[PDB]
Amino acid sequence: GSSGSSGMKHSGYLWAIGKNVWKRWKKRFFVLVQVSQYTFAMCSYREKKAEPQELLQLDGYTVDYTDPQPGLEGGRAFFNAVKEGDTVIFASDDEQDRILWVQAMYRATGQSHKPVPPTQSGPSSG
């Protein structure tokens, strides 16, 4: 039962909304930390040199590319994580970033269905 070991994989502002945390959908700081050898969590450090406000352990969450849900109007890319009884959505400024996030989050959780990048050049709405 050692203390553990910190670690950073990817940091940057992102749009996410959950049920217990980030109830609101707004661009907030997001940092992927490593809790255990095979366990990670999303720590949102909004303060300046202080403890994190919101935190979501990615212990199980299944992140994967998903269509743009009706409502969330923050970022372009859309990606939500599926949990036994919890569901959280995430969005970035560009599609390129999303991938980098899915690739990491994927391993952090260790889901069964590995995420894969689509081939949607860029259709037009009407």
Distance CA 120, CA 8 (A): 31
3-state secondary structure 103-121: HHHHHHHCCCCCCCCCCCC
Specify the pairing of strand 26-36 against strand 8-17. antiparallel
Q: Which domains does the chain have, with CATH numbers?
A: 7-117 (2.30.29.30)
Residues 6+ apart with CB under 8 A from 92: 14, 15, 75, 76, 77, 79, 98, 101
Distance CA 3, CA 81 (A): 27
Identify which of 108, 119, 124 has the alpha carbon closest to the alpha carbon of residue 39: 108
Identify which of 50, 54, 105 has the alpha carbon closest to the alpha carbon of residue 83: 105
